[PDB]
């Protein structure tokens, strides 16, 4: 965690239902957006840390 890795996601269709339909996640907080709303949205990039 002192040397955390960033992946830039770009130029693709996301599908956040692949994430939010899963029970595997011990936490899934969201800020400035709703997790169920994400499939209606668009972004210039997404950064996965």
């Amino acid at each position: 965690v002192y040397a955390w890795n960033r992946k830039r996601i770009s130029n693709c269709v996301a599908d956040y239902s692949v994430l939010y339909n899963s029970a595997s996640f011990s936490t899934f907080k969201c800020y400035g957006v709703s997790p169920t709303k994400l499939n209606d949205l668009c972004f210039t990039n997404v950064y996965a840390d």
Binding site: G32, V33, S34, T36, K37, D40, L41
Partner: protein
């Protein structure tokens, strides 16, 4: 410059409306001033606070 009293009334009423329109762009502490951003990003319970 003689008709300044009439042009002053026109100017004051214009400045009042231009201030009223500009205040739509202010956030007042919401995530966006655009009401369609709030509704297209947030759930009912979260949007109603904003």
């Amino acid at each position: 410059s003689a008709l300044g009293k009439l042009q002053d009334v026109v100017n004051q009423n214009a400045q009042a409306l231009n201030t009223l329109v500009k205040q739509l762009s202010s956030n007042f502490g919401a995530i966006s001033s655009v009401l369609n951003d709030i509704l297209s990003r947030l759930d009912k319970v979260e949007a109603e606070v904003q």
